Amino acid sequence: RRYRPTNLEPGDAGIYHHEGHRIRLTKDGRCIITCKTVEVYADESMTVDTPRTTFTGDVEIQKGLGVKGKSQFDSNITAPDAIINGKSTDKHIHRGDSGGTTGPMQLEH
């Protein structure tokens, strides 16, 4: 897919490359960047301060993730372990129905 819009409106402000990619400010408070690739090199940090950020594609995080609010995953997640309320899911047990202990989490069957 190639998307290099060229329309301009009265009052637009921008940075424009002759190949067609650009950064544009236009009416109704909109900033629109249209290009092949965006690279950000920020020595210290990037902050995105907005009520909602949406990524339409895949996201890869090469170090860690922290989330303060609730997370909703619509498809399966995979992890080597999930520590849930201090308890390893991989190795958790239960008090069994005869008052002993079960073995650890096992493969479905």
Q: Does 19 bind Cl ion (CB under 5 A)?
A: no
Q: Tell me if 92 is assigned to a ligand binding site.
A: yes
- Using CB distances below 5 to 8 A depending on partner kind, what does residue 7 bind out of Cl ion, Ca ion, a second copy, none? none
Residue 104 in contact with residue 92, Cβ under 8 Å? yes
In sequence order, which residues have a C-beta less than 8 Å from that of residue 23 and are 6 or more positions away?
A: 14, 15, 31, 32, 33
Q: Which stretch binds Cl ion (CB under 5 A): 22-30, 34-42, 47-55, 89-97?
A: 89-97
- Using CB distances below 5 to 8 A depending on partner kind, what does residue 8 bind out of Cl ion, a second copy, Ca ion, none? none
| Interaction site with Cl ion (CB under 5 A) | 96-97
